Amino acid sequence: GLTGTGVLTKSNKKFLPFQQFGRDIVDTTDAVRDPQTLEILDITPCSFG
């Protein structure tokens, strides 16, 4: 149900067993988990300028 766009890469975060996704200071989504692999993946915006 969480929609968006960006680049998905592996990160080193350590989520608790009841955590699903994390947010930064400005309350933007930067990390999610695979519902079928339970790994930690970071989200980065695509290039622009």
Partner: peptide, 26 residues
């Protein structure tokens, strides 16, 4: 049987800050 071995003491504690829980899963 009506085994009522407990009563209301109305006593409390003034050195507790324990009522904290996680509000969400973020």
């Amino acid at each position: 049987q009506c085994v009522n071995l407990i009563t209301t003491t109305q006593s409390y504690t003034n050195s507790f800050t324990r009522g904290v829980y996680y509000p969400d899963k973020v």
